[PDB]
Amino acid sequence: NLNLPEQSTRFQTIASIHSNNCSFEILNNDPGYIYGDSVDGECRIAVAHRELGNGLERTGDDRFLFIFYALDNNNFIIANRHDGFVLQFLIANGQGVIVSREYQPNIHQEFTIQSINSDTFRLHSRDTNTFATVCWAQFNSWTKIVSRVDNPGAPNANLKHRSLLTDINMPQLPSLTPLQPLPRLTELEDGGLSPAQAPRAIIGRTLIPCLFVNDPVLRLENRIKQSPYYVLEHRQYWHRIWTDIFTAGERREYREVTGINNNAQNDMNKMINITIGADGPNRLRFGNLSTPFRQQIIDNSNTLGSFANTNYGTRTDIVNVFNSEFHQVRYARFVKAYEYRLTRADGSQVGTPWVVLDRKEMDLRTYPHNMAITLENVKIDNADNSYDLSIWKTPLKLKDGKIIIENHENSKPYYN
Amino acid sequence: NLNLPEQSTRFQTIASIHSNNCSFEILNNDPGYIYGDSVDGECRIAVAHRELGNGLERTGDDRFLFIFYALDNNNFIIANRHDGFVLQFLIANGQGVIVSREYQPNIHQEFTIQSINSDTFRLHSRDTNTFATVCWAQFNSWTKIVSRVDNPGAPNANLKHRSLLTDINMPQLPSLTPLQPLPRLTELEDGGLSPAQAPRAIIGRTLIPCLFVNDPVLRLENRIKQSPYYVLEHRQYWHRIWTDIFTAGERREYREVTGINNNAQNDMNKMINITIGADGPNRLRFGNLSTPFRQQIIDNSNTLGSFANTNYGTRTDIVNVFNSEFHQVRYARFVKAYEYRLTRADGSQVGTPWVVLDRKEMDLRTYPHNMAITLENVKIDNADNSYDLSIWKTPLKLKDGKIIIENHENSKPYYN
């Protein structure tokens, strides 16, 4: 169920319909570079670093191959397979040219496809109202790619795709799976499933353009070839925070650390330009790089947009629990975990997943079955921010198998 | 699984956290209107039509109730339940105020939620960098709602929701179903399923804000109460274009009308500010009203954005077919239909569905089974536009049960 335009799931060349054999070619040229075949004037000399050429198409050559990354606003970022730089409109010496530059992004890297008919289109830069074509209509000559306004004299700007590459290492997306309740404990010695062992539900997954994935091992020129999209998974599991055998009437104290640490948020921001907002464990904040794709990322990952100006942090609660049963009882206490995992197209993990422990959704397993522990008291030891300072109303009975979610009736501000 | 913020699936009041009993109130006042409780100066006199009041909240009064419609860019359009008008920033007499106006839309109708903590937020107008609050911090007085820049001694702009309405007539969305192949024919008398009888697959469905649904029966003040969202369904079915018994070696001619009528496109544009682009039967063109929601509409309806400057039209093909079997054979010919249906929250249909017949995807049923008809020749009789003038390469064998899709190998321009 992949809802992308065909230009976004392949590489393609770009050519004037009036050119026999030439296509748009990525150059590493400098100002003063001579286009030998061109008539004299503005079409003969490069005015900018990394102009595009009207080159005889070489089959299999990455310098002619482009992928169109689809923005939420229906425009495209157009990246080349040779080095992963993107097309950009630029004025140098009063001449409108197409260059290749690193993804910024900026409005001059956004292109509009204007389809004239089934196989013919124009590449529109909407900010300048210009269309990409060959300098002075020299359609069969070595010269630069320009971007010009429509006038009577203007070179025809009708383009086509000359060649396609359809084998591009698209990822295989995992199937959605529901979050199951944890099994019952089987004996006193059963501590339940540890976080490493707990099954993950796949709640959502989205493609991420490789352009702003700071993969610590793959540089951009290799990402665009091997993993033009990455996969971000939204997973959930039941995370055990502690387990112990209690004697009849035994009282114990635990330090419960929930949320997500500052170092994990900084790693997530560096890697994909996204953080978890303080307003919830499924609430995403977007930076400048990820913002143009935010609605697709939210829709496909089954998260929500964050409205917070602060990131989710850690909180340490001191919890006092009392075994109010006259039996020896195994207690195992779990909170819901949100796990964000990034993989390459080959399925390889890019680093350690980012995990938010949600203190507001909690479950209990006991042996024997159907035992209940008393939550005597909760106190905040410390928190990284003041966004969520609610605590459980105590005393509270936690029963085997019963999920408790925070609401107006079972919680209060810490100072009441 | 509805992926919307909680503010988008309920109505809520808006209040200063520093007000005992007052909330934002929709007024139908004129310039010169006197706020009796206000101290003298800019807070006492209305400067614009339809200012907002700081009114003692009346429970169940629609003049205090707002729904937040979520834009693709993570901002909101805020509509009131009394008349369906939306909040807007306005400068009149050098004073920044909040007014209510008809959905346009414009950038001054876009509000950003800035969540400070769990139950406190600010309403940000990002173009002007202003925040909504009560004039001169008169939090317990009858006066107007202003929108001011943050300065030392600016009125505190921390807000809350005082009251909620959660029973709002949200639609119950249909389940997605797959498109099944048509059954085999059972005898010579079996003409197969007519278009009225063919089962529909539900390929996608999306919520549409009532603000730009030109319901022919329900005015805006009634839509916002009864159907704050409408449902747009993307359905598919197999549409029978003809069926006949052929004698051995019999030749016949059919006029096949495909695409969508201009009158149906105009009706769709008037109703929801969307048309089907000429680049495909699932390709949507958005006007000024629907554009701010386009990525949500595409993602949820499982359609694609159109790149065409032309709407899908009708085309009439003359097809010559030949029964190349030495048997009497029942032939039934089908094309794929795309059916777009709009319903209110109560499930009632707003108009006749909009149907695109796709000439490029075709199936055949025969009796007896496993028979093949010859497509001798295809000619275009007329078309509404020149966007797609491809025809089948003939002769072409159409086989019982075999779906044929247009590609580069089996089609050509009509003039070749």
Numbering used by the authors:
A (entry chain A), B (entry chain B): 49 to 464
Sentences from the paper on this structure:
Mosquito toxicity bioassays have revealed that both components in combination are required for activity against Culex quinquefasciatus larvae. Within each Tpp49Aa1 monomer, two distinct domains exist: an N-terminal lectin-like head domain covering residues 49–214 and a C-terminal putative pore-forming domain (PFD) covering residues 215–464. The final model of Tpp49Aa1 revealed the presence of a homodimer forming an “X” structure with a large intermolecular interface, similar to that described for natural heterodimeric crystals of Tpp1Aa2/Tpp2Aa2.
To do so, pH 11 buffer was injected into the vacuum chamber of the SPB/SFX beamline, allowing mixing with the natural Tpp49Aa1 crystals prior to data collection. Manual building and refinement from the ensembled diffraction data led to a model with Rwork/Rfree of 0.177/0.199 at 1.75 Å resolution. The pH 7 and pH 11 structures align closely, displaying an all-atom RMSD of 0.487 Å. As in the Tpp1Aa2/Tpp2Aa2 structure, an increase in pH from 7 to 11 is estimated to alter the net charge of Tpp49Aa1 from −6.518 to −47.822 e, suggesting that alkalinity will destabilize the crystal by negative electrostatic repulsion. Despite this, the binding energy of the dimer interface decreases (pH 7 = −11.1, pH 11 = −11.9 kcal mol−1), indicating an increase in affinity. The most notable changes include loss of hydrogen bonds Asn51[ND2]-Asn350[OD1] and Asn51[ND2]-Asp347[O] of both monomers at the dimer interface.
